[PDB]
């Protein structure tokens with residue numbers, strides 16, 4: 001069974017726990033390239049009453065650094081906002097809770113904006129079929145595959 005955070009049957013408690021960044025995508029590719037602020041490796045999602053605590057690590061010169069962020073529910077169901085390198089809002093267009101989670105985020109900084117899409121897995125990698133489903137979801141948002149970066153070969157410290 002699958003759901004979308006904006007859907008009526010979404011059960012947020014079911015996305016609690018361990019997650020790993022498998023693939024990131026963006027219509028501003030530099031944001032997720034080696035030195036980008038959005039090249040974030042998710043570790044866990046802690047589900048609270050009206051927020052999600054997101055725990056990540058970032059990488060620089062082969063050195064990991066821990067980063068935690070709190071995302072608050074907005075006025076629209078299934079949407080959350082969080083301040084990080086500008087103002088972000090995001091939703092989870094598709095997840096099956098037990099294997100993958102696909103997120104779509106809009107960042108706004110210095111009067112500009114860009115889209116970020118992320119595929120996270122319960123294990124450190126996902127099947128090629130799920131990775132293809134993610135590439136299709138990116139295409140529906142106008143993000144070319146050349147702007148999709150598989151990070152499954154570099155998501156561990």
Ligand SMILES: COc1nccnc1CC(C)C
Pocket residue numbers: 024038039040084088090103104105116117118
């Ligand atoms: C700031 O959030 C993020 N930034 C980079 C990568 N992934 C996320 C998780 C979101 C999309 C739910």
Ligand code: NA
Pocket residue numbers: 029030033
């Ligand atoms: Na580039």
Ligand code: NA
Pocket residue numbers: 076
């Ligand atoms: Na909106």
Ligand code: NA
Pocket residue numbers: 093104
């Ligand atoms: Na969408």
Ligand code: NA
Pocket residue numbers: 091104105
């Ligand atoms: Na969206």
